[PDB]
Amino acid sequence: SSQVEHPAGGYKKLFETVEELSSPLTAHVTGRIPLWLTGSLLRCGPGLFEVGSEPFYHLFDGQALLHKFDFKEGHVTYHRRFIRTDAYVRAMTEKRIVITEFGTCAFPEVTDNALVNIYPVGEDYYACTETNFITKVNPETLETIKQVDLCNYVSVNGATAHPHIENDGTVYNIGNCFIAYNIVKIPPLQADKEDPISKSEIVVQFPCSDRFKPSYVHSFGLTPNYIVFVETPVKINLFKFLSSWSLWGANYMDCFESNETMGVWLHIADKKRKKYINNKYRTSPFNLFHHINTYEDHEFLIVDLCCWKGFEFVYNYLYLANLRENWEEVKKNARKAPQPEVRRYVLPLNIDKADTGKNLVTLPNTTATAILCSDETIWLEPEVLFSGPRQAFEFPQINYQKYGGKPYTYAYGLGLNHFVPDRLCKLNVKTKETWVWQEPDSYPSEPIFVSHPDALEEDDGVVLSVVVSPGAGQKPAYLLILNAKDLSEVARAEVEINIPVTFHGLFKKS
Amino acid sequence: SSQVEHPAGGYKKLFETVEELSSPLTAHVTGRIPLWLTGSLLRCGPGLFEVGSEPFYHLFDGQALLHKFDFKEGHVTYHRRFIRTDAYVRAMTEKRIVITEFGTCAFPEVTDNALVNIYPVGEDYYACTETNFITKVNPETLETIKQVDLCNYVSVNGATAHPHIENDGTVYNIGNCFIAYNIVKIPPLQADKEDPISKSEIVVQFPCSDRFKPSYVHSFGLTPNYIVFVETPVKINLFKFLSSWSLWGANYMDCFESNETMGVWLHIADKKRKKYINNKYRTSPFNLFHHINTYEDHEFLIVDLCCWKGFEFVYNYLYLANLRENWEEVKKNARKAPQPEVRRYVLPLNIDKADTGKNLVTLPNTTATAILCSDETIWLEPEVLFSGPRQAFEFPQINYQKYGGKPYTYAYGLGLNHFVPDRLCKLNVKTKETWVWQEPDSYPSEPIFVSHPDALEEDDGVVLSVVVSPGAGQKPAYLLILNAKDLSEVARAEVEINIPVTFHGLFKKS
Numbered sequence A, B: 001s002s003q004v005e006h007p008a009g010g011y012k013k014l015f016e017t018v019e020e021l022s023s024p025l026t027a028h029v030t031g032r033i034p035l036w037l038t039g040s041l042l043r044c045g046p047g048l049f050e051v052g053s054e055p056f057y058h059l060f061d062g063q064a065l066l067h068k069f070d071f072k073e074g075h076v077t078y079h080r081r082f083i084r085t086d087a088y089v090r091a092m093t094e095k096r097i098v099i100t101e102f103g104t105c106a107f108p109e110v111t112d113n114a115l116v117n118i119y120p121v122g123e124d125y126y127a128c129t130e131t132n133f134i135t136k137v138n139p140e141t142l143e144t145i146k147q148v149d150l151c152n153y154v155s156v157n158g159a160t161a162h163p164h165i166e167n168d169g170t171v172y173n174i175g176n177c178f179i180a181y182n183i184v185k186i187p188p189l190q191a192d193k194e195d196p197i198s199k200s201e202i203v204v205q206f207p208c209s210d211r212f213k214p215s216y217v218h219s220f221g222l223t224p225n226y227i228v229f230v231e232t233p234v235k236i237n238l239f240k241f242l243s244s245w246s247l248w249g250a251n252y253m254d255c256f257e258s259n260e261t262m263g264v265w266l267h268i269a270d271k272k273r274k275k276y277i278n279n280k281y282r283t284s285p286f287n288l289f290h291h292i293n294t295y296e297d298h299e300f301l302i303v304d305l306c307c308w309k310g311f312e313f314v315y316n317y318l319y320l321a322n323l324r325e326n327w328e329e330v331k332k333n334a335r336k337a338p339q340p341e342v343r344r345y346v347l348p349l350n351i352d353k354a355d356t357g358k359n360l361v362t363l364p365n366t367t368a369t370a371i372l373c374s375d376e377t378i379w380l381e382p383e384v385l386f387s388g389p390r391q392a393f394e395f396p397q398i399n400y401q402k403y404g405g406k407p408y409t410y411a412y413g414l415g416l417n418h419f420v421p422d423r424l425c426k427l428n429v430k431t432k433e434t435w436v437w438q439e440p441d442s443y444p445s446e447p448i449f450v451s452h453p454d455a456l457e458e459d460d461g462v463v464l465s466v467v468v469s470p471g472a473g474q475k476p477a478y479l480l481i482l483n484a485k486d487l488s489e490v491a492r493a494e495v496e497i498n499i500p501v502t503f504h505g506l507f508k509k510s
């Protein structure tokens, strides 16, 4: 949890427009940048929060800004460029908001405002939002290369910003299809050297709980043998969605509603046999954005999640007007919001009818339960790994390359305090111990884990975070490096200019 | 949690018959009994597990044995007598099992086998089970005085072994009534000096979720202004219950079933206005035996519970044959049992229709939620205070006289390890810190808190526990005194004879 109030209101700098740079800045290093750290921290977020006099209203409406911190021989540069998407380009051309964004209707056609994440496919990198449009980008220069329409290649209306990437380059993702949820597989770059997106395919299909209302889906789980998909009670209303949007003045945010009665439905598929397994896993209602990690343990799937307790859409609390309020009013606004909680669910894969009425979770080191009912629904109760009052452990990361989809022990996260990001956290998921890094009037980003080249242990490496520090007599922002063992500070690299909020990113080794 | 396996199987001595004593034994004290500790630890449990060659089958079938540890000027005695109930008396007369016990049918009329608890009414003390029959006992001599039938005085089929006692002597309890749950109020002893049970009355009524199947109820919650009742999915089947029991050979255990669909329904009544409040609180399924404490905080009731996750009746795992198994088999049998968990629920008292769909729990120091749905049900999610794998924090106690029904911080409990009691625990409910006392091959009882008479702090005192220590090189059993601050040992008083399992009790000051 946090131990800090924010009465100065410096978090408002997270949502303040910035200019792109025409070339890299030098970042002033204090402490010592590890000499094994060679490569680029690439991150995405909004950078332009109004087009002239017309404002964007939602957190997810600002125009995509691609950020790069470069590391070589203990020295650090910083560079950033807006992504030349149709949304950005046409707004610059016409000097107004042209494309309708998530929570901002344009007045007189789907957004490609790729503000959320960036990921590798073959030898290319792609910025994304959660739509059918992804944007190829150049990771050295930050130049926009092209727009890609996923509809051209596979049958999906969108894809998440959280594809899973296996160690050989294979990419898996999930998307709505207007009625199912499709898993897309993009194969690795082959000897023919043609772009792998042209070899995309739908491998497996999950069913929908409602014919006319699919659930919002933000991420999913992957193990060597299984795909896990959590169907939440946050629904997309397709009657409102597919009507004339310039007629009654709609945006995406206006199409979401909450099913009060369904709770949460969890779904598994067999990955290698490409097959939906018909186990009716059920539990109480929550919003879900990020899976932490999933893995197999004997005949059980361990499903670690960042949850929000309730069925109201948490996105309702992320309008810029609210996030720009003063601290007492921020706290007040979050009182009635869903409560964040880290939870472990355990999904049995061997369902014996003879155990009807009993707990199937026979593993020795969990309190999670799964109860087989007579109607063959399997009711789940979680083990709570972390809980704090309006203190979210969010934007989780692990040592993904070696432990993703596999038994693990450590997760890193960004700590939210009534939605305001004010600390960095580490969680031991076996013992429930936590470590915190926190400074006053300092607003960090998602921590990203980088392994040491000779690591013997899971947490042998660093986490990198971009921190905004609007206290005057401090520099506006800096790149933070913490030791992944205890979250003790290793170095920071200060820059001369503000940096707005960023969501997700990656470290690209060189 | 426990840190100990039990391969020697010494816990079996908890379920072994013992002989009463004709007078007190001197207990050999080591360490130093506090000199302010003056009075009697009275506890109840089964003492006779077979009548000749006919065995009792269930944990709750053995004949009541009243225990007393006396404390005066640093010295300790131990005495124990079987309670001369109809069940015990008639079994001694006829040399067989005469009355049907909880899980033991008698072969050729309700049991009064008062093996569970003892409590004050007016100037008297009563041993009880959970039936309509309570047994007045003499706290100095341990003699059985009389049987009392609660049906003579008020309209209930039984009452729990956990009445709440207010500081002026007023007694509240809850019972089934064949269809409602009745709250019985026994007033304090008045100037007329007549027995307060003759002035008993039903003050308030809770409704049932099913006309023909009332829920098993073991305890309830009380604050200065409110009564809290948790209706669990463990149901009593009245069609089996009221049929001829010697016809198809039935006991009480045979009449329990589990409603798979209802989950848990929580109920509040206004105590001072004696009125059922019609708030439809709902949550996922669990067994509940013990409330820890309830209290009022602004317009919210805080409801601390020892839960068992699932709808299967935990009592199904407490047949003596199972508890007498070897350790590897005990652990195996408990794998599919409900998982114990300490949980804080928070019940809003101000329900605004305008907040439909949102979290009403606006308090600052909880992650518990309560969501108003459109059908006006209020769905609850708990804050988890303690969770360990088959490690129950059970038999909870607090500093009851000063903190019962009021804001509090500390709870003490008996720690179960796959149902085997092997440690003592303290839980800070605000911070979730725990303390443990544990020795190898030592099987403690419910810890009971005794304040230092001039304490101003909550945990300024001791806990007392009766510990069974089999295996040669130790005396069979002893009374343990721990400091309530840190659970560090203060003294122990060894005795020369075995002591079986005990459930509940009290300290009577002198």
Ligand SMILES: CC1=C(COc2cccc([C@H](O)CCN)c2)C(C)(C)CCC1
Pocket: A060, A101, A102, A110, A111, A116, A129, A130, A131, A132, A157, A158, A161, A176, A236, A252
């Ligand atoms: C095009 C599409 C969409 C549009 O999604 C958007 C549109 C704009 C902005 C975003 C943001 O990425 C949401 C926050 N990560 C998502 C849905 C996810 C709502 C449903 C499936 C189809």
Ligand SMILES: CC1=C(COc2cccc([C@H](O)CCN)c2)C(C)(C)CCC1
Pocket: B060, B101, B102, B110, B111, B116, B129, B130, B131, B132, B157, B158, B176, B236, B252
């Ligand atoms: C006579 C009665 C009963 C009988 O209860 C019994 C009978 C025998 C023994 C016990 C034990 O007290 C249960 C464990 N604490 C309870 C119910 C509580 C099941 C329902 C209400 C009426």
Ligand SMILES: CCCCCCCCCCCCCCCC(=O)O
Pocket: A059, A116, A161, A289, A314, A318, A394, A395, A416, A419, A420, A421, A444, A445, A446, A501, A502, A503, A504
């Ligand atoms: C650095 C962000 C701070 C402000 C927003 C914090 C609230 C986050 C709520 C949970 C995660 C929602 C998903 C956001 C990331 C994404 O778009 O993938």
Ligand SMILES: CCCCCCCCCCCCCCCC(=O)O
Pocket: B059, B116, B161, B289, B314, B318, B394, B416, B419, B420, B421, B445, B501, B502, B503, B504
């Ligand atoms: C010292 C007891 C050890 C064996 C039983 C432990 C399992 C208890 C399960 C939950 C509590 C059930 C109620 C038993 C006490 C009572 O009758 O009030």
Ligand SMILES: [Fe+2]
Pocket: A161, A162, A218, A289, A290, A504
């Ligand atoms: Fe995300």
Ligand SMILES: [Fe+2]
Pocket: B161, B162, B218, B289, B290, B504
């Ligand atoms: Fe009890």
